[PDB]
Symmetry: D3
């Protein structure tokens, strides 16, 4: 019931080490991430929906964890999430359907 909470927490504790021990690298990465996700022609929620689809296509539970968490914070609706997942399924078939299930689980977990 706290599967993705644990995944994201555990990754975050390792990432704190990276930020201390590879500070130039992580500063560069942070700049990339912030530039990619900032408000622009596409708003932040829309970019995070794009991120969620990518997370599912890349079959990465950590990404699914963090971006579903962010989507809840950005107040994405369940319907907006499902429709993003549908795009991943169309462009990934069976395996993306499996990770779409995980993304729904993550989103529901972080939704309370």
């Amino acid at each position: 019931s706290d599967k993705f909470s644990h995944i994201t927490k555990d990754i975050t504790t390792q990432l704190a080490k990276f930020r201390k021990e590879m500070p130039e690298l992580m500063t560069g990465f942070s700049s990339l991430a912030q530039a990619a996700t900032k408000d622009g022609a596409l708003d932040k929620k829309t970019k995070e929906l794009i991120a969620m689809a990518l997370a599912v296509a890349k079959q990465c539970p950590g990404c699914i964890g963090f971006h579903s968490q962010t989507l809840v914070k950005l107040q994405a609706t369940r319907e907006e999430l499902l429709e993003t997942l549908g795009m991943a399924v169309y462009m990934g078939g069976g395996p993306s359907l499996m990770y779409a299930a995980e993304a729904l689980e993550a989103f529901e977990e972080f939704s309370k």
Copy 2:
């Protein structure tokens, strides 16, 4: 200068046979594709931006070709494309940058 026109045309020629010879499979596929891309909580343009990011992440010149063509049809702006490519680069690093290049080329080609 006709690079992605030729890529998409050549794929379409092969798929024309596949569609007729595997009609149950491909009516299944087309219905999945239509269901995924239809207007809903997300509009069609937004879903095609998601498709473009996925095409780049999948490193697939054919997908990039078809979805760039569709983005032009849906009148996505250059800036909307750029920002969705930005998300692919954040989630894919160096290799995604190589296919962001292809997406920009394809988009420009189909924009005339």
Copy 3:
């Protein structure tokens, strides 16, 4: 000892939600899946062996779960499974060997 039983059960509960909330999409997907796996020039067991190899190549525990379960139901032998896995290893190297191990574990789990 019930690792893959739990994986598949958990995915199935999310998929029931998808079937209710994205019924056109899941109907389309179901049609695709049924057309792909139905008896033809290749029998159903052979297509599921193909699916198992793909599941291993795609490194997807959910797919490995469901298709190993189906292989047992279709009465695939252990030798037929291993030889399919061998093909994945030849075309995937080290990482596919890791997921081949998981596929054997799944198959043995569902075999009683």
Copy 4:
């Protein structure tokens, strides 16, 4: 019309050097390949159909080229190929369809 002939020939030219300069590696590889593809519980044609599905899932024109050539040698039927491509599409969605196109083209090319 000689597309996959040239792709495979060009790869073979490069690999000819690699095989002589990394002979321990490549005798290791060839023995793995032979062991994987040998007749067993699954016959050779069936294993090459599995290889074709994997080649498509790996989105690799070179693999698609070589394995289509081998399928013709093993006298796989067009319908057997179509059904294995069907499985790749079910497990890969849109992007796999782009490489199913290439597999059909390659198979036709080597069929004369």
Copy 5:
């Protein structure tokens, strides 16, 4: 606290079955692996750092497990590991950062 110990142990028990039941295949694979990793122009530690980067790029917990274990045995430093991981992040973006976190966790686990 013994996550990767369990992953590698469990894979190893299945691999013992493969070695008995597909002895030609596993002999071939073993030859490939030994030729790839043996001392040469690049020493063994350097090749294992290459393996670790590949394991992260391929998002394979099993590979991450075994190669981090080998790196400790080869007395790779923590700094050598982090810098390898940094290369994976540069060429993988967000998702490789997630698996880099897992690789650090694995390395620390096997380091005592």
Copy 6:
């Protein structure tokens, strides 16, 4: 004989636009790339050998092109390249062999 020269030049032409139109993103990216590839516990040549293995594993002709060019600049030996390709083949099987072919071709092209 100018294959990878043209590939890299063509990508660079597209990216020249991308860099100016997404300057926050791409200054972020360049700083990440520089931070990742800088001399440290691993020297620059070693990191570029890691990058080459990753490029091959990602099956990306563009990456293979750019990183082969850089390897020549860093005066990597042919044998150092061969051994890093060996690692990619061990971790990728048949498909990686197809891109090892491309890496050898690119390296030879940029070596003159």
